[PDB]
CSV table of C-alpha atoms in Angstrom, one decimal:
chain,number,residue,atom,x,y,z
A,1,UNK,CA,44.1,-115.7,169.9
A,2,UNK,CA,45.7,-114.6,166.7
A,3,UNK,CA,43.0,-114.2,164.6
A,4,UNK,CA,41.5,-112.5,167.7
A,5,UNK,CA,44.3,-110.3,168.8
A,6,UNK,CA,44.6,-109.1,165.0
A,7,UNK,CA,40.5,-108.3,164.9
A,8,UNK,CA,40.8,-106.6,168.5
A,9,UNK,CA,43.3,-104.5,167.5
A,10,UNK,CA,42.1,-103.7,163.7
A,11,UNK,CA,38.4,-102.6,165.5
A,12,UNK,CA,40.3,-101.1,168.1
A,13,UNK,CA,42.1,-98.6,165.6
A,14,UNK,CA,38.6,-98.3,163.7
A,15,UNK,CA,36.9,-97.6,166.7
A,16,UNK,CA,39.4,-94.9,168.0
A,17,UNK,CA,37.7,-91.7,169.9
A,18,UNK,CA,34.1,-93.7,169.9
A,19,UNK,CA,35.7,-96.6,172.6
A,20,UNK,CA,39.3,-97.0,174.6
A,21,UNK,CA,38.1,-100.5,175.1
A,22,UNK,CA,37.6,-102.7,172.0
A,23,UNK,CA,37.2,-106.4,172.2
A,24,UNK,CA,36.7,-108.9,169.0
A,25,UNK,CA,36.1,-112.8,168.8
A,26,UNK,CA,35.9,-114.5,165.8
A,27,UNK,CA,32.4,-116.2,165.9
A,28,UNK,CA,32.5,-118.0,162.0
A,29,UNK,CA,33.9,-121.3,161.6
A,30,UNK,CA,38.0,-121.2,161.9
A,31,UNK,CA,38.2,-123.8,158.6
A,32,UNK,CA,36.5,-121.0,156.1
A,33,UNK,CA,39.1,-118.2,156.9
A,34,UNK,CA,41.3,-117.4,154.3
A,35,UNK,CA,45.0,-118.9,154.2
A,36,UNK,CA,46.9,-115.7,154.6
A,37,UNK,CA,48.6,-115.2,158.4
A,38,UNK,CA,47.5,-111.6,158.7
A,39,UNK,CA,44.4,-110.9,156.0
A,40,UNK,CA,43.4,-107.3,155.5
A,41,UNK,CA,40.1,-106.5,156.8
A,42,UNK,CA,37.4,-104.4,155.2
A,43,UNK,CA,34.1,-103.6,157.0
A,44,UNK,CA,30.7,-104.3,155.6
A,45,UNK,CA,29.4,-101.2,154.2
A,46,UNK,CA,28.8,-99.5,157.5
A,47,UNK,CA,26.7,-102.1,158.6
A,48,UNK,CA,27.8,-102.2,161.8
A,49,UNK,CA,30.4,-100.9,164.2
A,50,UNK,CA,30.7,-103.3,167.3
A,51,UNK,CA,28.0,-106.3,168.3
A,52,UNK,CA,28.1,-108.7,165.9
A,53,UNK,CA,29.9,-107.7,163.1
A,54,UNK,CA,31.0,-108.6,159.3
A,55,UNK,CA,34.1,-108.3,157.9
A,56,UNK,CA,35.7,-109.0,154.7
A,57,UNK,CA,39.0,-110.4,155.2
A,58,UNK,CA,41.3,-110.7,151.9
A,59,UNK,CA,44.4,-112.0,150.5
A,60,UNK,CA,45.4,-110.6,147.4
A,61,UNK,CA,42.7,-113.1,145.1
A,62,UNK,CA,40.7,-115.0,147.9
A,63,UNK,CA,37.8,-113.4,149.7
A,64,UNK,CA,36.2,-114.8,152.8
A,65,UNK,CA,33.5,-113.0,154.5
A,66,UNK,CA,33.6,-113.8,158.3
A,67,UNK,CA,31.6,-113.4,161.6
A,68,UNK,CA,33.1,-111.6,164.4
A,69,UNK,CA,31.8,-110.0,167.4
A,70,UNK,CA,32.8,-106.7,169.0
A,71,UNK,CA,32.7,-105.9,172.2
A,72,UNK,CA,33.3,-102.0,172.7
A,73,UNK,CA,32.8,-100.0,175.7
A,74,UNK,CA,32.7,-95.9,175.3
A,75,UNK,CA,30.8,-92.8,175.3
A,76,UNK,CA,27.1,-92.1,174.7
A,77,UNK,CA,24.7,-89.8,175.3
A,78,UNK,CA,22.3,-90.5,178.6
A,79,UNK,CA,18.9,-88.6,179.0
A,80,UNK,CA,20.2,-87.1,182.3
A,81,UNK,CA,16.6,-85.0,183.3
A,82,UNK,CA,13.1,-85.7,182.1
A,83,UNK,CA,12.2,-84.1,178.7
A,84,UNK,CA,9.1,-83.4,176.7
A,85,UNK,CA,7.3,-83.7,173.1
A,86,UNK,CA,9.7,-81.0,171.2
A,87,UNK,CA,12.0,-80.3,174.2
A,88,UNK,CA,15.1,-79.7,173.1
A,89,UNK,CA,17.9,-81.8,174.0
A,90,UNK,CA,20.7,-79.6,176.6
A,91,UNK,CA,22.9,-80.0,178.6
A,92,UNK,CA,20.4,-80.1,181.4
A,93,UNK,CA,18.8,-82.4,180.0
A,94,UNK,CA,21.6,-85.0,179.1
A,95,UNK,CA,24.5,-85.6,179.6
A,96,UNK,CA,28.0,-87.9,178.7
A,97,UNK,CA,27.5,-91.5,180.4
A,98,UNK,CA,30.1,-94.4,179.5
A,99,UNK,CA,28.7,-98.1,179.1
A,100,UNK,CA,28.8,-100.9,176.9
A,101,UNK,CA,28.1,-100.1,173.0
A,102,UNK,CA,27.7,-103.2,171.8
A,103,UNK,CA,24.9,-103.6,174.9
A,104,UNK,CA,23.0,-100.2,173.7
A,105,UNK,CA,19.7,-100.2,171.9
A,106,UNK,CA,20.3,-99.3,167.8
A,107,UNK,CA,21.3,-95.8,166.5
A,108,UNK,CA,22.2,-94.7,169.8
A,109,UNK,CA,23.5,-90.8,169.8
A,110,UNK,CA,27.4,-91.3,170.7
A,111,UNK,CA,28.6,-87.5,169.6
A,112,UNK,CA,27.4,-84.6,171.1
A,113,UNK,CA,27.9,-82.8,167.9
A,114,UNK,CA,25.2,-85.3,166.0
A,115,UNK,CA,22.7,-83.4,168.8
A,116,UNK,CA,23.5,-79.7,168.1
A,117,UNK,CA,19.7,-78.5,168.0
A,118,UNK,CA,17.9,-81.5,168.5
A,119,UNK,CA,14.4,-82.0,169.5
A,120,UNK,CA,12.1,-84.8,171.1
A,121,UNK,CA,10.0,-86.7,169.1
A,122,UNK,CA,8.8,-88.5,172.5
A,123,UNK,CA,8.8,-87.8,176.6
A,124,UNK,CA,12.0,-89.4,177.8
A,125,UNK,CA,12.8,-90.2,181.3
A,126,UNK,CA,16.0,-89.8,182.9
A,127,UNK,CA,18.9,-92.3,182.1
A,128,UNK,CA,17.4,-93.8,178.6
A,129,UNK,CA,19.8,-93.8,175.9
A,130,UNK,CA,19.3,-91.2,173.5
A,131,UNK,CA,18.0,-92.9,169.7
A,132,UNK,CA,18.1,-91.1,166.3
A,133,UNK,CA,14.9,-92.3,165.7
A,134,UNK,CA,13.8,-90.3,169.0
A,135,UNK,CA,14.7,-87.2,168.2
A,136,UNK,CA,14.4,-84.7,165.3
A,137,UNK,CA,17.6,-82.9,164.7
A,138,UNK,CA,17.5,-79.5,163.1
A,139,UNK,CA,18.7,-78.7,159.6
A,140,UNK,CA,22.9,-78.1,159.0
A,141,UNK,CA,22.8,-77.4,155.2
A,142,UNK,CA,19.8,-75.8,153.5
A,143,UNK,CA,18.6,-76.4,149.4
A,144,UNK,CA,20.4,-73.5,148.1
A,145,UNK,CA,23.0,-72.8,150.3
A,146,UNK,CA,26.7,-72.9,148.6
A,147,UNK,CA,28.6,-75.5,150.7
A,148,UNK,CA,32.2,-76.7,150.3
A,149,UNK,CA,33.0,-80.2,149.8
A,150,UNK,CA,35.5,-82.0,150.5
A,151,UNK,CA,37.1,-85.4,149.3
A,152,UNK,CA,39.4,-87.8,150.7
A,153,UNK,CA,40.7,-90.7,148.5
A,154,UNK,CA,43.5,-93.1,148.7
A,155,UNK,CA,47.0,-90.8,148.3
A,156,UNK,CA,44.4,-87.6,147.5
A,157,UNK,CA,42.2,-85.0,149.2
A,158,UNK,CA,39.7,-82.7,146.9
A,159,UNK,CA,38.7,-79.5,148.2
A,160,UNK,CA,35.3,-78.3,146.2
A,161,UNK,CA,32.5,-75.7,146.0
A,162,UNK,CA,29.2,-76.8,145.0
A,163,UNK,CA,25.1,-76.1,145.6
A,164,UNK,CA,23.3,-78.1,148.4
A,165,UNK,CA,20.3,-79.9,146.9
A,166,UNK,CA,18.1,-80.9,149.8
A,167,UNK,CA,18.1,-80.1,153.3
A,168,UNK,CA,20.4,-82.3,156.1
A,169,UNK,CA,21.0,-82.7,159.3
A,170,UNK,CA,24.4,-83.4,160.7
A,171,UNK,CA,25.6,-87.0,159.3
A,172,UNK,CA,22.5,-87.6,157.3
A,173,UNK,CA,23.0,-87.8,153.3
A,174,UNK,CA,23.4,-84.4,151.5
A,175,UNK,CA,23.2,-84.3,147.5
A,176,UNK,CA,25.4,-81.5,146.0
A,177,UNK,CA,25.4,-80.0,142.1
A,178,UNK,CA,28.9,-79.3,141.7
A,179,UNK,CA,29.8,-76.0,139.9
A,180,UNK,CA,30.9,-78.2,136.6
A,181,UNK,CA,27.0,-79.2,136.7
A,182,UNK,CA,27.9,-82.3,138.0
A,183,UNK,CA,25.6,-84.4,141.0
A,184,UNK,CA,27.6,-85.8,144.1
A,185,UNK,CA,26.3,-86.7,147.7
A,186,UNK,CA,28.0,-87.4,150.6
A,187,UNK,CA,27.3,-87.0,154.3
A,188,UNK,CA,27.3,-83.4,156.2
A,189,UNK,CA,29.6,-83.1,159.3
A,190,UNK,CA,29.1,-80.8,162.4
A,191,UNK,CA,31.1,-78.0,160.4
A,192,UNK,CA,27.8,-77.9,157.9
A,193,UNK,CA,30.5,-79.0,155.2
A,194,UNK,CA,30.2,-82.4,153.0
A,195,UNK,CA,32.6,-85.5,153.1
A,196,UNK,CA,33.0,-87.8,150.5
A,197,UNK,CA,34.6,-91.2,150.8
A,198,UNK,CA,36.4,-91.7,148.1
């Protein structure tokens, strides 16, 4: 209940805009937790949003790496009309439904702006939760095309122009030769431009 309420509400703030409706049970064994009243918490390498979760919970020398499990409820996107091989996903086609995230199958589509210009791999029927692995989504950032890139570290931001390597879709991994001749990736967002995480 402390542990708990301190896990419901660190997901909760994680899991702001994707669920209004976030809660976390510590699942690991109470004994192995480390000593500290209120640990800070650091995800698992995007392993994971909600389900059954891993977090890394520190104080200051001590690591533990506990078992929690999520239980989010929020927004994804519902096949809404029946679609065809290549059809493109619209908004006749789909549509916003809310339900339980942690209940949905994996790589589930929760932002409409992740299916700008997406296709079907498959024929879908109506109310089937729109997969990543379902779909083909067209191409944000082209090899060649100048993008801007931006950086966001602890206590700075980095603002940067650089050359797109490869071709990527929306939140899949974009490698970038920055004008000093230097090679970063990151991920591209809706805007077509590339975050980096530190």
């Amino acid at each position: 209940q402390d542990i708990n309420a301190q896990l419901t509400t660190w997901f909760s703030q994680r899991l702001a805009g994707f669920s209004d409706e976030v809660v976390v049970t510590l699942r690991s064994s109470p004994n192995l937790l480390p000593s500290c009243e209120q640990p800070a918490f650091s995800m698992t390498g995007s392993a994971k949003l909600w389900g059954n979760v891993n977090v890394v919970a520190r104080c200051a020398n001590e690591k533990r790496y506990l078992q929690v499990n999520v239980q989010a409820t929020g927004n994804y996107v519902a096949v809404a009309a029946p679609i065809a091989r290549g059809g493109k996903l619209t908004p006749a086609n789909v549509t916003l439904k809310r339900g339980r995230l942690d209940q949905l199958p994996p790589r589930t589509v929760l932002d409409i702006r992740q299916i700008q210009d997406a296709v079907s791999l498959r024929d879908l029927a109506p109310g089937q939760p729109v997969q990543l692995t379902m779909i083909r989504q067209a191409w944000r950032v082209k090899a060649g095309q100048r993008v801007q890139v931006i950086a966001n570290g602890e206590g700075f931001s980095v603002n940067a122009e650089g050359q797109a390597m490869n071709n990527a879709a929306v939140a899949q991994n974009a490698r970038v030769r920055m004008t000093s001749g230097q090679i970063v990736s990151g991920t591209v967002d809706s805007d077509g431009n590339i975050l980096i995480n530190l």
